Design a protein around this nucleic acid. Structure first.
Ligand SMILES: NC(=O)CC[C@H](N)C(=O)NS(=O)(=O)OC[C@H]1O[C@@H](n2cnc3c(N)ncnc32)[C@H](O)[C@@H]1O
Length: 529
RNA sequence: GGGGUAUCGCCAAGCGGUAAGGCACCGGAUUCUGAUUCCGGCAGCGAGGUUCGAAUCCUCGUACCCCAGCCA
């Protein structure tokens, strides 16, 4: 329960409404991102929670910026997230002729007219945040003149920017939006759904209130920027022959630390190639978060955990993080992986290996146990090995012993180095019947695995407010290791995310992995203190 | 100008009845993952008025967001 829902129960009891009918109106000019998920939960959840209907509508009014590619993806992430829409997918373009008729109703009613101030001009007459606007000399043309001219615009008689249809509101209203907001505009650009049937497109403020109405929406839910815009949402509706009037309520938009979220800036990392793609695993996009290894639920949880308020906010990473972890900790079966590897030879080991039994999930044997190849020419993570270390360091010490994960207690007793003085091997001896702790991978039965260690894309908490967000990208947002994993990981089906013991939760990256060079993305690391 | 916001480090309840939970975080217990679990540990813009008493009320100021695209 949040204020929007609180309003919903009230609108219910009074009987202002019977069923709720919400909507998600993303424009198809980029992919969805976590923020949208917030928006996607609000509207889809309210509806199902109230046995209502939510639809997916692509507010495709600006042909020039939108592309078919997006609508396909927006459609997917929506499903993927876990929601289904009411009836078919509706496009604002579905209501184009509808908007046209309505523009005419305003014209005939005399509340809209063909203004001819060049764009530059239209702004000058607009006035400012403190100085009222000034009526255009065209403002008062006759209904007959307006109908004629509109039709011309529509018939392409005017070049782009040479004419526009405008409402006749109040040029000196404090709401800049009511200063004779433009209704239609000329754009000779093929629309992704109507092709070239249209030369004049309608504006969002115009399109949006009508679509909602014509759809039967009970609560147009949006983000705060559109609060001023509520004035014109009601005006248009309050001035055309349409039978319902969806009330609008806005809320705060999701802001995440260390990552921009504007479909534009995201769009910029993509175009200027600073990331693999909209879905590069470092992105805040859903497509990305998915490839990164986020479970629809963790996202839906995140969304649940941050509420919907009118307050400005900026969620920390640890929140989104805590979420995937809560999910994965409980579901992902553990495995063995070694990210940095130095060879460790147990000279006391005679033979060619054996077979150590490891659980799939230690706090839940319910997921059974697997069989992994133990040996004496194994691998380990360099950071487990130290010739010198304090009392808190629990891993391998030059004269100590560490219980190898699900196997034996070895005991380093020598070491060896090279040119630069870095070690190449740690000769040690294993105990006989013993079955701190560390993990490992038999070098022999080792699966060569590429590992992509990800980190927050941007170096600063609020790259948005930065001068050049690109200039503040973390060069270490991605760090490609080359490690070795037990042979089980051979059968990692791109999808499940295993938990490489003591390292993090990983998933096989489904944009690069091959039969021989599987690629495991680190969704999120573990809590290390 | 106008439209908004003002409770813990980050979110988020409470809507006059004497300040929820979440995440971060610091202690302690277990753990062949320094994880997991586990218990313990840390609060309402300012100033005034209003009440018996208000974070929720009235007023002043203060802050910070948004609005001068033929983008949405
Ligand atoms: N009346 C409205 O909702 C505005 C719709 C408009 N076409 C729009 O905002 N375009 S959009 O494609 O950028 O966004 C579509 C809808 O997604 C949600 N949304 C957009 N940006 C968001 C953000 N940063 N955080 C959370 N939710 C966000 C809104 O419901 C938005 O309308």
């Amino acid at each position: 329960t949040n204020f929007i829902r609180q309003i919903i129960d009230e609108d219910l009891a009074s009987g202002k409404h019977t069923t709720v009918h919400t909507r998600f109106p993303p424009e198809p000019n980029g992919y969805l991102h976590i923020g949208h998920a917030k928006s996607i939960c609000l509207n889809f959840g309210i509806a199902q929670d109230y046995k209502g209907q939510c639809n997916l509508r692509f507010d495709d009014t600006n042909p020039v910026k939108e592309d078919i590619e997006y609508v396909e993806s927006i459609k997917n992430d929506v499903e993927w997230l876990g929601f289904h829409w009411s009836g078919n997918v509706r496009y604002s373009s579905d209501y184009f002729d509808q908007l046209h008729a309505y523009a005419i109703e305003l014209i005939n009613k005399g509340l809209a007219y063909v203004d001819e101030l060049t764009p530059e001009q239209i702004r000058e007459y607009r006035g400012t945040l403190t100085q009222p606007g000034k009526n255009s000399p065209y403002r008062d043309r006759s209904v007959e003149e307006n109908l004629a001219l509109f039709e011309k615009m529509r018939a392409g008689g005017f070049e782009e920017g040479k004419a526009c249809l405008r409402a006749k509101i109040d040029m000196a209203s404090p709401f800049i939006v009511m200063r004779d907001p433009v209704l239609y505009r000329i754009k000779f650009a093929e629309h992704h759904q109507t092709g070239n049937k249209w030369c004049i497109y309608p504006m969002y403020d115009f399109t949006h209130c009508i679509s909602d109405a014509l759809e039967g929406i009970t609560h147009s839910l949006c983000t705060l920027e559109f609060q001023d815009n509520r004035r014109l949402y009601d005006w248009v509706l309050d001035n055309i022959t349409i039978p319902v009037h969806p009330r609008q309520y806005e809320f705060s938009r999701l802001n995440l630390e260390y990552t921009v979220m504007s479909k534009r800036k995201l769009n910029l990392l993509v175009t200027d190639k600073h990331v693999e793609g909209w879905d590069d695993p470092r992105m805040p996009t859903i497509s990305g978060l998915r490839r990164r290894g986020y479970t629809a639920a963790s996202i839906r949880e995140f969304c649940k955990r941050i509420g919907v308020t009118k307050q400005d906010n900026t969620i920390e990473m640890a929140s989104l993080e805590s979420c995937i972890r809560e999910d994965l900790n409980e579901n992902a079966p553990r495995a063995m992986a070694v990210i940095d590897p130095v060879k460790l030879v147990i000279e006391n080991y005679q033979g060619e290996g054996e077979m150590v039994t490891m659980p799939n999930h230690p706090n839940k044997p319910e997921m059974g146990s697997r069989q992994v190849p133990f040996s004496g020419e194994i691998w380990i993570d360099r950071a487990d090995f130290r010739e010198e270390a304090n009392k808190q360091y629990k891993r391998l010490v030059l004269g100590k012993e560490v219980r190898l994960r699900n196997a034996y207690v070895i005991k380093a007793e020598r070491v060896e180095k090279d040119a630069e003085g870095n070690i190449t091997t740690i000769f040690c001896t294993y105990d006989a019947d013993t079955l701190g702790v560390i993990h490992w991978v038999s070098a022999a039965h080792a699966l060569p695995v590429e590992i992509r260690l990800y980190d927050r894309l941007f170096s600063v908490p609020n790259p948005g407010a930065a001068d050049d967000f690109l200039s503040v990208i973390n060069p270490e947002s991605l760090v490609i290791k080359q490690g070795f994993a037990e042979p089980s990981l051979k059968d990692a089906v791109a999808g499940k995310a295993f938990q490489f013991e003591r390292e993090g939760y990983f998933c096989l990256d489904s944009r690069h992995s091959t039969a021989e060079k599987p690629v495991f993305n680190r969704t999120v690391g573990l809590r290390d203190t």
